[PDB]
Amino acid sequence: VEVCPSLDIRSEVAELRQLENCSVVEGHLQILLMFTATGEDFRGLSFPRLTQVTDYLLLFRVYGLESLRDLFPNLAVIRGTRLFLGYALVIFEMPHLRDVALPALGAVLRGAVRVEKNQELCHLSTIDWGLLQPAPGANHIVGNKLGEECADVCPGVLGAAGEPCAKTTFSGHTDYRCWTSSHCQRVCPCPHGMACTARGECCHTECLGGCSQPEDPRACVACRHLYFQGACLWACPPGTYQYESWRCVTAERCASLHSSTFGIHQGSCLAQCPSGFTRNSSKECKVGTKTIDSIQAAQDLVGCTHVEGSLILNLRQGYNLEPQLQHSLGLVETITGFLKIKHSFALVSLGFFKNLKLIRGDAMVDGNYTLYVLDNQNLQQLGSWVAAGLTIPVGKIYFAFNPRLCLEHIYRLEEVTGTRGRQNKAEINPRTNGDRATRTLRFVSNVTEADRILLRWERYEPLEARDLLSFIVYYKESPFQNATEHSWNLLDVELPLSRTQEPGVTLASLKPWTQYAVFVRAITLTTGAQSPIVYLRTLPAAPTVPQDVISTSNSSSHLLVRWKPPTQRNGNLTYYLVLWQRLAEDGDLYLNDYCHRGLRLPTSNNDSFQKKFENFLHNDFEIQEDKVPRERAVLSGLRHFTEYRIDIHACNHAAHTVGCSAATFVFARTMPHREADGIPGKVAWEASSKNSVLLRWLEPPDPNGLILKYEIKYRRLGEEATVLCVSRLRYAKFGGVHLALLPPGNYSARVRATSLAGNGSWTDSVAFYIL
Template sequence: MGHLVPRLFLCLTLALCPLLVRSENGPACGSLEINDIGDFRKLENCTHVVGHVRIAYVDFTALNLSLISFASNITEISDYLMVYRCPGLLTLESIFPRLRIIRGQALLFDEFSFVVYENRNLRELGLVELLRIQKGSIRIESNPRLCFVETVDWIFLMGNATRQHYYLKHNTPPSHCPICGSLSPDYGVNQNTSDYCWNLKSAQLRPQPPRLRNCPVACGNNGCDSAGKCCDRNCVTGCSAQNCTLCGNFKSRFGCVNQCLASYEIHKRQCITTKQCRDLGRIPLTQGYRCAEKCPGNQKEVLDAKGILHCQLDCSGDFHVTVAEDLEALQDCVKINGSLTIELTNIKVEALEVSLENIKEITGYLKVVHSGQLTSLTFLKNLDSIKGTKLVENKYALYVVNNHHLEHIWPNNHQVVVQSGSMYFHLNPRLCYEKIMALAPSLKSVQKVSVVDVSPNSNGERVICGAGVRSLNATVDDVNSTAVRILLDYMDWDGMETLMGYSYFYKEAPQQNVTMYDGRHGCGHDNWLMNVVITQSRRHVISGLKPYTQYAYFVKTLTRTDYHMQLDAYSTIGYFQTLPDRPSPVMKLHGSSELSSEILLHWWPPLRPNGVISKYVVTYEKQNVTEKQAKNYDNSSPQNFTQLDCQCVEEEPYYSGPQADDEDFYNKDQIAYEDALPNLIFVSRSQLSRVKKEFDKVIDYAHLIRTRKEEPPKPTTTTPAPTNESLENDRKAAENYEKFRLDSELSQRLAQDEGKEQYNLRHAMPKCQDSHASVGQQVEEKCVLEEILEGTQLPGNKHYYYMTNLEEASFYRVTVSACVEGVVNGCSTPTEVLLKTWSRTNRTNAN
């Protein structure tokens, strides 16, 4: 392999590199699980893996690897490659000598496309023909003898370096490993003269575009052809997407494309027409536009009038949803030819919203029982009708029983028609009776709903309903980058009588289409965050928000209730967006030098941009340091910048909502009621003796008539004519009452406005008009001087920079700062790295 390296690096056009050109046709196989030596037979006669390859717990220590060949012909893996805990394995070249691309279309843990973890004997990776890892991150960790990891240009391998990351941790330190172009085992100088290599024999294949110089700015570091047309990054083995031999995503008849449009995807790598799919004996699926061998699980094979096989959604039968796996059969269903029963045990409400959102019609019944997680049925947002061809107990088409936290039924301004049958609602303590009876007009075959069908006693007994629910007006009074102040209208007399405080609900809302019941989970892990405030103040500050983020919010009162005063209030949903702020530092820097006077610098955007990144500022200066000092440099490493050992993790706040530890948590209202009941019905003996009454024994009806006393006639009452004195007394009483009312209202308003100053938000100070303002002027005018950053300014959508006119074999200290638009001094703390230019002397000596 080593003798091919010089020729590969001299390639200016890929027409000179036949090694990179392979046949598009070849046998494909599905995902491969390799758990013992015998499983390697699965790799035979397979060139494309449509899925993943997992090699785990395979023991190579007892084998004579020189006598056994595991080499496969696999060139492509559509999803991911994982090698985990394989003792005795020395190099992956013995298994994948021809692997050229890992596409990462489905990722391990939704993140990684290439994982090599805890292989104690692994010496090198050895993927000598690998050209691209199109999507997903790379994690090579805890392989104590692994070398030639830092000598791979991972940036070059990535399809989108600003979204992909690589983690190289706890392998053999680079200082204990050979370097590219070092001595071979026979103490001769190796022919490998590249700065990037997989081992001592094999340089990393780095096919270059026709040219990098004098290309349009839009080409970036992809280069261009001789005509000045930018090379397509989607083409791995060439410049033009129209005649490419290996595409990063999909290949169609028009060239490389990111997705299959008006065509059908096959083997996760190619787009073909309907006719081509049929000619292969496969079925074109309109859902997902795939060319499949057989119909998916919830679809059935159907022949049309011409005898052509099609797949048709088969949503027939009675479906019982208890766990997430039960939703697979309902995926993409629009009409359920049968009934749907929802009885949840352990499932996220979001899963219901995704899987059941397309359902428009249920021919049988809908039954929702024993589902404490549900706060509403809005996950059936497109349901229009329940036909009722099959009924519960031969009577009910809508059957809703024993759902402790259910408080809303259908989406707002949406009604579901029930063609046949009635409805049955019982033991839903937070669902108001009025909300249920509002469904009565949608029952087309039922004239009247009785208390047997819908109980006014077992529905809504734990919440305030009807006229007791009022509207609450909440507005955004002030906002900064991390906090918002909510202002409520003054509460009236009746509301203040029972008011204890307020609950403020809020959540991130990229789109303004949120309802109160989206993502709500009655048993905890509610994705609405909640602030509970036990105060009558009409102001509240919600803090700890993300900058430059849109939020939805609503407010609810906290009230004490008794038998005479039952009031509650809700606001409508409002939206606000926090202001931008300084971004977090640029995540990572990477530099490579292939010319003695140049370094190509690459960086990842900030983890928290906190606004629109308007520009990056790059600075670099020469440093007089030695190799030893460079290795001890705190924030960098020469030529390659690797992941720091300590990585900051974004902490997410706990979801709100009750998380009970005892079985009585949800029965507190009932317990309080039972404790108060004896006091309510207790009557003292002395009081009993005063009201005690003798009852005569009734012998017969005639005796009852004789003993019944006639009630004395009530005297007629006459209202005396008002006198001047009484009119004056009434006037004074009215004046006193009005004065008392005004004084009470004033005291109530003062109570709601108490401590106004503690709800003030801090704002960034504006830029001083005078660019040379003194400290005194800044304090007096409450402004700040704008900092002018020195360095090269680049647009916010650019993540690389060529540093030119540098000195050979010299170290440079490089910093990159990200700046947010519209923020005074809105640039991040600079991220820095120490990089070294290439040395022609070392290369000459190596040759």
């Protein structure tokens, strides 16, 4: 019946009176921020005419409101075409709201319901959203008043005065459904979505929220699909098209309601044509002040051609956003409002406005400013939308702090704008933008050494050398090629006292194989000319020795060696050269008698006039090698319990250099072999007529290092044993041992060989009798 577009009500109860004649609100209905209100203002206030809301219903902080049973006694259907953050019925921070009280509500077509942070709200558990929403699983109803603190008194289970109504299960809690203490939910037996009148009979399917005559689309209270001349229809056949997805309207009527950019494609009279389409009766772009904060917020204007509004670009966290921004922006030909850029750290150029041509400046920044560029920490190019393209009928251009942008670009933009004298300082002020940035000097010779660099640039002609003074060289170690002038190392170069022999400079005390960024600048008498930054790499050299070399022997034939890379690589390390050589035991051990004067056993390895004048003017043994590409190395095929000298070198690309780094040396020893010290075979015994016996045994084949002494243990059967040591010389003198002056009887003898690693293994006992 009525139009009643979307409305928001704030700050006064009188403003609520604009809903007197409304019947179907064609948009969102918001009621919020009503502090100066009591419980009596809403007591005598009612809007029975309202029966439908298209977008959503929002209530937020409406003081003095106790129940909605009077505000919306006939609200039946919420279409939910446009949802507020995915919700169709929002109630937030509402004091004194005792109950929701929507007795006439029929169904929520789309969207969830959010009711939370209500101080004194109860009677919510007796409400089931299954018969209202087609998917009540998205609702969020928490944080209200405690369920135990409010009694769900209604005409049902409790002894109330009203007649009880039926019950319906919601989530397994089959209880009574009661909207309020008096009004309760309406339930009728019929398929879902079939609206029923007060008589319990459900009417024709297109009826929604109520009816008055069974099976009569003309008598419906709210058309489910389409509304047309008081009738409910599936579509709009004859000559009309859908409007706001809830009614049928003629082309002329919808055109009048939309009064040039409206489209009537796909049988819908939309206010704006979609992407890739033009006006058709069978791309202009609108926004008030769009703040582009990131790439994800810049996809609203894809294909936008005539943007009637203002843009505020503020990008601080992005990087390389030129093509992403140029994908959306770039087809814009007219910005009616103002272009404003603040604190755009991410942006580096304004080249995404390729076909920007006109800014009429209907809306402008406060202070008669059309173009407002401020605080762009790194902006250089300023795009290519210049050279007789732009024109500004009204407004002033304000350019500020693009310090990486020279004033030449702003001056060119001002010249091609057609006006120059409109503005003055503090808006295109010097010493304000472009502080961090013209004759350019050219280097003619660059000699790189191991720790020195020699530079020579072009010499000025006598005409241009009149106003020339000593040069200044800035050089600094930059590993990457992303260095620029504002940590720079300073040098002063006095110009040569001749018309030839170009100045040049020598830089010393430089680490080998390093990249240095260097550039020169002339003093040029008055307050001028400088050379582009050049990156030069010094010659490599031999690296340093490896650090902290350690070794271990996990087995009897392996040696794991680990160390650390050198301090300065002096290039790129390609590999390590590892040399090992077997070391033989000293000859002292082969001559000393070790029965006495014993020794420790080695263990296995286990783990200024010029400046002042300028200022005044201005006013057994074998070497084996390996090639280890990684830090750790493993040596295999080594002898058991033998000393090894390990040499390690560090090698960069030193084919032409003096060679690899100086060797670092360590000493390691392999673990002893367990069974290498056993005496081979069995010991033999013989007797002699002169009350004596002889014992013989073969030496171990591969002893650990060497055999120092042989211990022979012998005893008479049944008592203690008396061991005896035999040196190498004593054993080799007779091939064994002698035992003389023994009383008659039987004896058991055992032998054991001791090596440099430790004790051996006792051999089999030999039994010999002497009589």
